[PDB]
């Protein structure tokens, strides 16, 4: 489970990992301090974020992003990108002339932190608005709700 899989060293920029230790008081890797924050609006930090080891600069809990703006929801449809998933948001648009609605949808590419493991296609995810993380990504997954049709 190597973390350093890139050409540059991966580490949380806040945590200093070169502090001097004591020889007689150290036997094995003692601890690596973990940087994590609690995002607002009542969202609880997942356990895997606090006690994990992954490095994600776009993670809402262990990264540099701040959640602000719209809190949305959607269902996972594709998981074929690194730390990024595609969710679909279905809604009904009212046509005034016919007094009726039509089904419409929009796909949003949202960032999924490694603190959410075993997220499946069809799960309901709560996303929060953040700064542009890529060309199309502007939302971060904050909570994953398992689908009713799951194990």
């Amino acid at each position: 489970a190597d973390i350093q899989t890139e050409r540059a060293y991966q580490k949380q920029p806040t945590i200093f990992q070169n502090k001097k230790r004591v020889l007689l008081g150290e036997t094995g890797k003692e601890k690596l301090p973990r940087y994590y924050k609690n995002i607002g609006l009542g969202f609880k930090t997942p356990k895997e974020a606090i006690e994990g080891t992954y490095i994600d600069k776009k993670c809402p809990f262990t990264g540099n992003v701040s959640i602000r703006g719209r809190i949305l929801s959607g269902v996972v449809t594709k998981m074929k990108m690194q730390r990024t998933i595609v969710i679909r948001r279905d809604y009904l648009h009212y046509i005034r002339k016919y007094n009726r609605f039509e089904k419409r949808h929009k796909n949003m590419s949202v960032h999924l932190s490694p603190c959410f493991r075993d997220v499946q296609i069809g799960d309901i995810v709560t996303v929060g608005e953040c700064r542009p993380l890529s060309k199309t990504v502007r939302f971060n997954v904050l909570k994953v709700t398992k689908a009713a049709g799951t194990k």
């Binding site: 607002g40 609006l41 009542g42 602000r68 809190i71």
Partner: protein, 262 residues
């Protein structure tokens, strides 16, 4: 496009200036200052349109350049200077002082005050921050930075400052039961007692206010300006005491006044 605009079309001006459309193409574009463009009152509007002391903008310029107008105790020669909520306008030559207070219809009333009450004003604080070697600071709705404020003064409270020295004299906490004024929106100009505040994290808070006659309304927290402790005001209220009358009672009072007076 290409840098800031310097004109204001007369029909794009704030509606509470009560400007008419046939006078000209332009309205006096208020200069930058302690108050926002859409919720201020340019000195020319007050001196010409309200007080009728001048007939044209040239006469307003003459009055202002004679150093007769004092806003918050300072002589202001700018005829488009933005004067706003709780600002004190003192004209020493004619010996009258005005305080810019919204009337119940959302417009700046010509509210005359005694010279004793013209020596201070109420300022809602916008932020408190610590800077420059642990020195607390305080920013008001009037864009005044007051150093070394009382540690009990937090955001959304209103302080009372003496105009001559520019120092905090007293303050009122933001709490239920305190009298307040609405400075924006549909209920702008109304005066009542704060009854309940609903907090919406990540969004705007809602404050519920009740009048003296029991009418209850609500507005966003940014639009609340607490006037006094409890139900008594620290400043003098306009001819209407912040009560908004429905059009039926307005018409009834107008008809009764027409009947009684001949």
């Amino acid at each position: 496009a290409r840098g800031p605009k310097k004109h204001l079309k007369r029909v794009a001006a704030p509606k509470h200036w009560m400007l008419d459309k046939l006078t000209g193409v332009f309205a006096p574009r208020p200069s930058t200052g302690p108050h926002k463009l859409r919720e201020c009152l340019p000195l020319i509007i007050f001196l010409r349109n309200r007080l009728k002391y001048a007939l044209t903008g040239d006469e307003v310029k003459k009055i202002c350049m004679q150093r007769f107008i004092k806003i918050d105790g300072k002589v202001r020669t700018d005829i488009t200077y933005p004067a706003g909520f709780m600002d004190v306008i003192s004209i020493d030559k004619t010996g009258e002082n005005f305080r810019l207070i919204y009337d119940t219809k959302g417009r700046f009333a010509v509210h005359r005050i005694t010279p004793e009450e013209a020596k201070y004003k109420l300022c809602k604080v916008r932020k408190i921050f610590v800077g420059t070697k642990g020195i607390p600071h305080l920013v008001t709705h009037d864009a005044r930075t007051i150093r070394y404020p009382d540690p009990l003064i937090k955001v959304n409270d209103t302080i009372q400052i003496d105009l001559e020295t520019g120092k905090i004299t007293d303050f009122i906490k933001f709490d239920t039961g305190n009298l307040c004024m609405v400075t924006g929106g549909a209920n702008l100009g109304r005066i009542g007692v704060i009854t309940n505040r609903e907090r919406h994290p990540g969004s705007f808070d809602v404050v519920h206010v009740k009048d003296a006659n029991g009418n209850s309304f609500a507005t966003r927290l940014s639009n609340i300006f607490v006037i006094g402790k409890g139900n008594k005001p620290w400043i003098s209220l306009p001819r209407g005491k912040g009560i908004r009358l429905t059009i039926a009672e307005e018409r009834d009072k107008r008809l009764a006044a027409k009947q009684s007076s001949g």
